[PDB]
């Protein structure tokens, strides 16, 4: 691959680069430096490449096409770059050329072929329909794909990938005015979407995730009005009747229940309060570690419960000694016992945690402090077991996440959003320091590699960049440094954070960033040299 060859001002050079280097090298443009993106995705390049793609798509004879896969990937890579790069912004004549190229592939006699080579190009075409803002333009095709799908198509990895892209189209259509204006009247689409979700042959099959996505997008259709409304309702009713909230088809049932509940009246479907009934069914084991920790789990062994409780129990005492808490909670905080909610797997977490705890689940778990002052507030850590998690509890991220509960109750006044200064360095650093103590090779490695952060930079860390190196490793390094070399300052900072004096907290660590930078650097040196 040679990414520089996409920067030429001649569109023929760029086309030659796409053809000769292929989709695997085009992948680089999604994350290339801005200079390359502004040059690769000139409006003229997008136009000329779409015009070439139109002619190639018209001639396509089935059986896949490495070149068309690369061309459509490039075009939607351009829309990705345009969305995230303020210096990439297409002129108004780009998208009609892209729409013409999608049209050429859609109108081809081979559009509905079932093969993995076809699926590879078809995938990039369907995603381009969303990336290019064309969600309103191919609803008959979405309908045909939903109705044509069967177990033969489902054998092919790249056909599953491609057709699953129609749910991305439905989802992205929410921001498309022509789509919103028309989707409520798409009665055939609604029927095909419902019947796709109802395919019994999807249960336990490689395409079950698609039927689940269909159930979700069907429930989302209740946010629109029009001649399709009664078909949407009928099909949702059949989903809720055919499947159950826990058991066969529950990914489909719960996918639909989530959007129905948010956008519609749960009582029109008989699914009100389903979240609390689901919780009792999925999280059916209860194991009380102590007055301050209780586990609710889906399917853990007794050995796992005992090991989780003793690991958290050890961290709990270590936290209280290290943070010099006196076991005195902050004021206005009645989160007296952490509830640790452990699902059997990442998949189970993705299926059940969302509705039970009203959270997004594209993550490795999370701690919900809630509002500690409200009577009835429940502090919930939501997690899952994994085979490569830590023995002997095998709960992913348990030891780190548990510290957020203790830091929240004993160090930081208020709910999660109460601070009016940045505190990510402390929150994440103390969770790493308490849970890992001095066993942190990754933290050493990020000093050794030559790229470092100052105290001042660490204190400004945010979740925005999602720089996990800066957040977790350098957060840990700064916390460990302050504990080992300046514990009295930490105790002084904690007087302010415990009371919610966030300005005093900031003024306090501002002093650290100027005074201690050079010692922080020597401390890193000693840490590296100890490793050798």
């Amino acid at each position: 691959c040679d990414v520089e060859a996409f920067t030429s001002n001649s569109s023929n050079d760029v086309l030659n680069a796409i053809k000769t280097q292929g989709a695997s090298c085009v992948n680089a443009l999604f994350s290339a430096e801005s200079r390359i993106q502004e040059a690769a995705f000139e409006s003229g390049h997008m136009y000329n490449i779409a015009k070439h793609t139109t002619d190639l798509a018209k001639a396509y004879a089935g059986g896949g096409s490495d070149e068309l896969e690369a061309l459509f990937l490039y075009l939607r890579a351009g829309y990705y770059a345009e969305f995230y790069n303020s210096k990439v912004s297409f002129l108004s004549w780009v998208t009609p050329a892209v729409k013409e190229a999608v049209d050429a592939f859609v109108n081809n006699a081979n559009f509905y072929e079932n093969s993995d080579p076809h699926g590879k190009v078809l995938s990039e075409v369907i995603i381009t329909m969303d990336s290019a803002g064309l969600q309103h333009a191919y609803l008959p095709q979405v309908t045909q794909w939903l109705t044509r799908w069967d177990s033969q198509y489902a054998q092919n990895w790249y056909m599953r990938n491609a057709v699953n892209g129609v749910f991305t189209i439905l989802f992205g259509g929410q921001w498309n005015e022509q789509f919103v204006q028309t989707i409520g009247n798409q009665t055939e689409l609604a029927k095909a979407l419902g019947d796709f979700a109802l395919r019994s042959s999807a249960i336990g099959a490689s395409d079950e995730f698609m039927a689940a996505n269909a159930g979700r997008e069907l429930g989302r259709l209740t946010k629109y009005s029009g001649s399709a409304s009664s078909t949407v309702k009928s099909k949702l009713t059949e989903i809720f009747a055919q499947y159950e909230m826990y058991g066969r088809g529950d990914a489909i049932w719960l996918g639909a229940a989530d959007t129905v509940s948010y956008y519609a009246d749960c009582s029109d479907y008989g699914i009100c309060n389903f979240e609390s009934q689901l919780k009792g069914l999925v999280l059916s084991q209860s194991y009380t570690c102590s007055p301050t920790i209780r586990i609710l789990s889906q399917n853990m062994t007794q050995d796992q419960h005992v090991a989780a409780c003793s690991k958290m129990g050890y961290e709990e005492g270590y936290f209280h000694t290290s943070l010099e808490t006196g076991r005195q909670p902050v004021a206005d905080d009645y989160n007296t016992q952490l509830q640790v909610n452990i699902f059997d797997s990442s998949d189970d977490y993705g299926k059940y945690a969302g509705p039970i705890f009203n959270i997004s689940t594209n993550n490795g778990g999370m701690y919900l402090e809630g509002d500690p002052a409200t009577p009835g507030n429940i502090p919930n850590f939501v997690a899952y077991e994994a085979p490569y998690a830590n023995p002997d509890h095998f709960v992913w991220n348990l030891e780190h996440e548990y510290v957020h509960y203790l830091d929240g109750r004993f160090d930081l006044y208020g709910g999660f959003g109460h601070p009016t200064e940045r505190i990510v360095w402390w929150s994440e650093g103390i969770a790493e320091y308490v849970s890992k103590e001095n066993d942190n090779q990754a933290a050493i490695d990020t000093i050794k590699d030559g790229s470092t952060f100052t105290l001042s930079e660490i204190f400004e860390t945010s979740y925005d960049g999602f720089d996990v190196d800066r957040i977790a490793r350098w957060g840990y390094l700064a916390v460990r440094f302050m504990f080992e070399r300046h514990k009295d300052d930490v105790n002084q900072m904690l007087i302010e954070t415990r009371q919610g004096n966030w300005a005093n907290y900031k003024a306090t660590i501002n002093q650290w960033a100027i005074l201690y930078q050079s010692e922080f650097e020597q401390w890193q040196q000693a840490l590296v040299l100890e490793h050798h």
């Binding site: 989802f171 689940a212 996505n213 994994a386 991220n397």
Partner: peptide
């Protein structure tokens, strides 16, 4: 509410935070 799920979902992710109402 969630976006549709891709064919592959990562098991060993980092945590999130915030809203669970």
């Amino acid at each position: 509410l969630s976006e549709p799920s891709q064919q592959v979902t990562e098991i060993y992710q980092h945590h999130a935070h915030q809203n669970g109402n």
